[PDB]
Design a protein around this ligand. Structure first.
Ligand SMILES: CC(C)C[C@H](N)C(=O)NS(=O)(=O)OC[C@H]1OC[C@@H](CCCn2cc(-c3ccccc3)nn2)[C@H](O)[C@@H]1O
Ligand SMILES: [Mg+2]
Ligand SMILES: [Zn+2]
Length: 841
């Protein structure tokens, strides 16, 4: 054993030893119990970043822990390869997105390998390969024939200068983010998943996920946004029917989740596209401009509530079917055509949004609910205004005194009896639009024939291969400019036809890759039936919180789709869900005629004062801490951390600095501290072996050990129990590291020089290297080989010796008849050592 710890010598050797033993190349061995630990696979952007390293270290800690406990562990990795990064990198560098992608995959693969992740590389997948995406094209065609995938016209934001379609998040004040030109709303045909047909299943199945964070479940329930409410029809007043046709001349229908407050509606509001708005604005230019400004909007859903609510009165009136009151119709910008009936009632007394709207325009507020003896104030909003469970109706006529649910049913009865409304269930969830006007994505397996219509490609002809010999320019989607791709024969009639040129939303590939890992070379289906039956579902899933809504809902949706196709036997893809925090770092710049400088290119000025540039030496200015990004150039390249300290130090620093959910602050001092602990770990074993070498670890009956060695064995088996619970239950690895640190501290203060002392020392070290192996496997594998000849993974996870956790009875008489023992005896004077104590009073 070499005296000093050198990661560059031991890490490649350990990886070679793990690869040769093929410990991570697992099969459907029904002898060992299966465990499927999955981290979210990355985009092949070029290099690993520290977010990657944190995620895949967390995934590897859990995997190695379960491996040491005798599980058949699958930890697969792969590449989420389609998407815009490759297309933009293609435009900037004049390279094909495929070539750029495969280069990144090779570089990042070697980086992941140098980090020591116990990955089954034989199960590797790349979603941009035809052997992957042929199967989502296949599922597409099956769902398309069933109607779960349909084609319908939709509205998109078109940029006329950049010649591409933009998302709402990419539109700034009506203009494209890069071009700066006014976007144009255009109606074009697109494809959709009917995810709304699975809404009730997606919502209810969330209750099965007892090992999911409650906030993720809450966020998904709110996204689906189911509501049990009431359809209500307000008769149009006889003076307000000018210009309306059909049922819009008869009534204005709205949806409401608060029918118990119908007595308190003081106005109604319609969408800009509602026929009432059209007929009212017919002679009023102000309303026409308000309708136009509404249509021109491009508000993202994460900003719909932050949008200022504006409205204009129309001069039209409707009648409340419960109290006869005449109510004015307003055009409002928060009423969305396509949600419900595109019309809502407003109760400013018991809905906060209605309260602010009515306060802006001085519209009436009528209290109809009371909660306790609370005073109602028509000028200040109070939280109890919106109370449903605790309130009781007032000012509501014969409905006074009822709670929410009995008022709901009573209003439903009155409405249904006179035909004015009925109960209705609604969902905020929209159907999933998957068409993309991009090149670097999975082609849509539809052929357009003017005789046969939209024809799905036959299963024999799949895949539709995306041609990789393409360098996107910058004047529209390249596939629509390639007749060599889109000119084809109809597979129903043989006539001239045109392939679909739009590609699929890249969320589709990540909605099922966890099943493809089960059988990634299966040529006869998405996943082989024997593999899906053995691996079942993912036991542990790790990834960032930014994917808690869309990706997770998509993955759950796809699982139920594949289940209903007969491909899988699970309702839910992920059993346990751990979400990792962000990585943040200080920022630095130097002013321009700012240009942010990377932290690794900077040294800082015993107390730290200021910072300077490394190459030069003249000062730089230090800014605030925030998430690592290209925006402020504060991303710390993990490769430089590997090169400076080794992979074990990188893995230790990220697991010790913060719990997985908390944000991790980059610290040069912290990284050095982790490296010093590994040096200490190395020195502890080395010094131990140099005074005697290895012995048989202490085992069994510890009666006869000294108190100091009994206390060290108590610390050992308490640390083993603590660490085991931090890995398996709390998933809090920083405290597990601290606990091993405390075990080593007590070991250091214990004289382990005797024969029984060496045996307890051997036991302590053999446990501490196995306890740390999931976090720092390279140095622990090396240290274990010097301590013990058995294979580390076959020695197994350390067991807790309950006998070491037990601590080590005298009589006490008063006046004859029934230091250490005197203190407790007086809590019930000469003391015979160990047997009797006598109270001499
Ligand atoms: C399942 C699919 C949809 C996953 C998708 N391919 C993806 O997100 N691919 S990805 O390649 O972007 O990330 C793969 C995977 O590991 C990293 C996690 C990082 C997020 C938090 N973060 C980022 C940073 C950071 C640090 C330095 C520089 C820049 C940024 N610091 N902290 C992801 O959430 C995900 O779990
Ligand atoms: Mg259960
Ligand atoms: Zn045809």
């Amino acid at each position: 054993m070499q005296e000093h710890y050198q990661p560059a010598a031991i890490e490649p050797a350990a990886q070679k030893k793990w690869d040769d033993a093929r410990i991570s190349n697992v099969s459907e061995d029904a002898s060992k119990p299966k465990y499927y630990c999955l981290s979210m696979f990355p985009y092949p952007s070029g290099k690993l970043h520290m977010g990657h390293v944190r995620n895949y270290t967390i995934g590897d800690v859990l995997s190695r822990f379960k491996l040491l406990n005798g599980f058949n562990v699958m930890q697969p990795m792969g590449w989420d390869a389609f998407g815009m990064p490759a297309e933009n990198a293609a435009m900037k560098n004049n390279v094909a997105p495929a070539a750029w992608t495969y280069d990144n995959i090779e570089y990042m693969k070697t980086q992941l390998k140098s980090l020591g992740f116990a990955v089954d590389w034989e199960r590797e997948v790349a979603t941009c390969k035809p052997e992957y995406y042929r199967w989502e094209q296949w599922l597409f065609t099956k769902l398309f024939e069933k109607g779960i995938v349909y084609r319908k016209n939709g509205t998109v934001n078109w940029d006329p200068v950049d010649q591409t379609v933009l998302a709402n998040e990419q539109v700034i004040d009506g203009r494209g983010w890069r071009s700066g030109a006014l976007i144009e709303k255009r109606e074009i045909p697109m494809y959709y998943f009917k995810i709304t047909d699975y809404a009730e299943e997606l919502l209810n199945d969330l209750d099965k996920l007892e090992h999911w964070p409650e906030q993720v479940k809450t966020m998904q329930r709110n996204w689906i946004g189911k509501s049990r409410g009431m359809t209500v029809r307000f008769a149009v007043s006889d003076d307000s029917k000018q210009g309306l046709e059909g049922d819009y001349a008869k009534f204005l229908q709205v949806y409401t989740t608060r029918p118990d407050t119908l007595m308190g509606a003081t106005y109604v509001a319609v969408a800009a596209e509602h026929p009432l708005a059209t007929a009212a604005a017919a002679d009023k230019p102000e309303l026409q401009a308000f309708i136009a400004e509404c249509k021109a909007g491009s508000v993202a859903e994460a900003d719909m509530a932050t949008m200022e609510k504006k409205g204009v009165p129309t001069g039209r009136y409707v009648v409340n079917p419960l109290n006869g009151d005449k109510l004015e119709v307003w055009i409002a910008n928060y009423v969305l055509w396509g949600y419900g009936d595109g019309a809502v009632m407003a109760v400013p007394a018991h809905d906060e949004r209605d309260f602010e709207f009515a306060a802006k325009y001085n519209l009436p507020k009528k209290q109809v609910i009371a909660v306790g003896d609370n005073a109602f104030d028509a000028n200040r909003w109070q939280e109890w205004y919106g109370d449903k469970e605790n309130g009781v109706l007032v000012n509501s006529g014969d409905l006074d005194g009822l709670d929410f649910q009995t008022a709901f049913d009573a209003v439903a009865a009155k409405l249904q009896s006179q035909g004015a409304g009925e109960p209705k269930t609604q969902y905020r969830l929209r159907d999933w639009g998957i068409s993309r006007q991009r090149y670097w994505g999975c082609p849509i397996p539809i052929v357009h024939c003017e005789k046969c219509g939209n024809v799905p490609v036959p299963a024999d002809q799949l895949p539709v291969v995306l041609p990789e010999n393409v360098v996107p320019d910058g004047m529209g989607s390249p596939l629509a400019k390639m007749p060599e791709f889109y000119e084809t024969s109809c597979p129903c009639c043989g006539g001239a036809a045109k392939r679909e040129t739009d590609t699929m939303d890249t969320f589709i590939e990540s909605s099922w890759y966890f099943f493809r890992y089960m059988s990634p070379k299966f040529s006869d289906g998405m996943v082989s039936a024997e593999s899906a039956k053995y691996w079942g579902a993912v036991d542990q899933y790790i990834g960032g919180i930014e994917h808690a809504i869309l990706h997770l809902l998509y993955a759950r949706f796809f699982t139920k789709l594949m289940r209903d196709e007969g491909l899988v036997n699970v309702d839910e893809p992920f059993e346990r869900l751990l979400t990792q925090g962000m990585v943040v770092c200080e920022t630095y710049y130097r002013e321009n005629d700012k240009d942010w400088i990377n932290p690794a290119d900077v040294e800082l000025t015993g107390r730290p004062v200021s910072a300077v540039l490394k190459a030069d030496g003249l000062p730089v200015v230090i800014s605030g801490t925030e998430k690592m990004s290209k925006s402020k150039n504060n991303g710390v390249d993990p490769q430089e951390l590997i090169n400076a300290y080794g992979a074990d130090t990188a893995r230790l620093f990220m697991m010790f600095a913060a719990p997985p959910e908390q944000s991790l602050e980059w610290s040069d001092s912290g990284v050095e501290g982790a490296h010093r602990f590994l040096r200490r770990l190395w020195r502890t074993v080395y010094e131990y072996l140099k005074q005697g070498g290895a012995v048989k670890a202490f085992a069994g009956n510890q009666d006869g050990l000294s108190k100091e060695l009994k206390d060290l064995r108590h610390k050992l088996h308490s640390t083993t129990a603590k660490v085991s619970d931090d890995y398996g239950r709390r998933q809090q690895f920083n405290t597990a590291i601290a606990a091993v640190m405390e075990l080593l501290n007590q070991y250091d203060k214990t004289d382990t020089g005797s024969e029984q002392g060496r045996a307890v020392a051997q036991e302590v070290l053999e446990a501490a290297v196995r306890l740390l192996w999931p976090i720092v496997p390279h140095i622990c594998e090396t240290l274990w080989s010097e301590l013990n000849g058995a294979k580390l993974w076959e020695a197994g996870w350390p067991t807790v010796d309950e006998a070491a956790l037990v601590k080590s009875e005298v009589m006490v008489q008063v006046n004859g008849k029934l230091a250490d023992l005197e203190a407790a005896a007086l809590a019930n004077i000469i003391v015979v050592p160990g047997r009797l104590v006598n109270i001499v009073v």
